[model samples]
Target: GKITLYEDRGFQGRHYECSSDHPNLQPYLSRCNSARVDSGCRMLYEQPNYSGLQYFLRRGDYADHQQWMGLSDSVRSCRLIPHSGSHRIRLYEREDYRGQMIEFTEDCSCLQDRFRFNEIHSLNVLEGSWVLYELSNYRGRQYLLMPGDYRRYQDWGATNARVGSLRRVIDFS
Candidate 1:
């Protein structure tokens, strides 16, 4: 993945380019106002160490932070969302992989429609990364889900287990 971050809007001013995950960008950049994702989708963090607000980016030119729905110009970290392989994930109604379970290979606009529940207590991402949304139609809070086992909802950085939608990461212009 390749991405360039500009300190000023319109892709101008002090800049930093990266081809992989960067946990910190404070030294190379002060404040990010724009970005250009030349290849692959990326996740931008509002703070260092991959904590704080997250924004998803596709291969495109973001002339301003508003393009990514950024809350501010304080982007401090970046992670390349792996788009390799087929997408797959498991959702469970109870914690520790118990209760009714469901496997998903594609995006779910309304998880409640398929799972018959709004709260996802546990899950296993068996194939690819995904984004879990708190509200249906891809709205509300988001939690990035990489291939792994989330024994509980908190393991995925969620304050609650209420998941309304899920979307897989994909590379495209």
Candidate 2:
């Protein structure tokens, strides 16, 4: 993922460009007032080392900090989220791929009623793009997932292991 962070609004002032993950951005710049995602997807954090509030950035331009899901002007860290080729995934009810497991190839609007579980502690995305919702019927906090093995809730940057819904990312392209 390639993104440029500007110190001033409207894509101006001294800037720092990033094409990969940055655990701590304090050494590069103090604050970011604007951002532009040139390619791929990224997750921006308010605190350093990929902690604090998270904001997803798709391929586009965010001229000002207000455009970042009501985030503040400070962005201290960022991580690239690459796209996978398919949409197959396995969700585990316990951490480290333990407990009741279920595979999904389609969207699940309500996991509590359908899968008899509402918490997902670990997961493995075999292919494609996917999104996990914290509440049932696809409501609440959203976490984008690419193909990878998440051994724990924190692995996917989630505040908790509770997940009630999931769906494949619809690609407009």
**1-173 in candidate 1: lDDT tens per residue?**
79999999999999999999999999999999999999888989888988887788889999999999888999999899988679989999999999999999999899988878989999999998898889999888778888998999889877889999999999784
Q: Give the 10-residue window scoring lowest on summed lDDT in candidate 2.
A: 164-173
Clash counts per candidate, in order, are 0, 3
Give Cα-based local distance difference scores for all models: 0.90, 0.82
Question: Residues 55-133, candidate 2, lDDT per residue (tens digit)?
Answer: 6667777888878773588889987776655579999989999999999998889988877886899999998768788
- Best-performing candidate as measured by TM-score: 1
Q: After superposition, how far is residue 42 of candidate 1 from its true place, in Å?
A: 0.6
* TM accuracy, model 1: 0.95
* Native-referenced Cα lDDT, model 1: 0.90
Off by over 4 Å in 2: 106-114, 128-131, 136-146, 167-173
Give the CA lDDT, 0 to 100, for residue 45 in model 2. 85
> Candidate 2 at 109: error in angstroms?
5.3
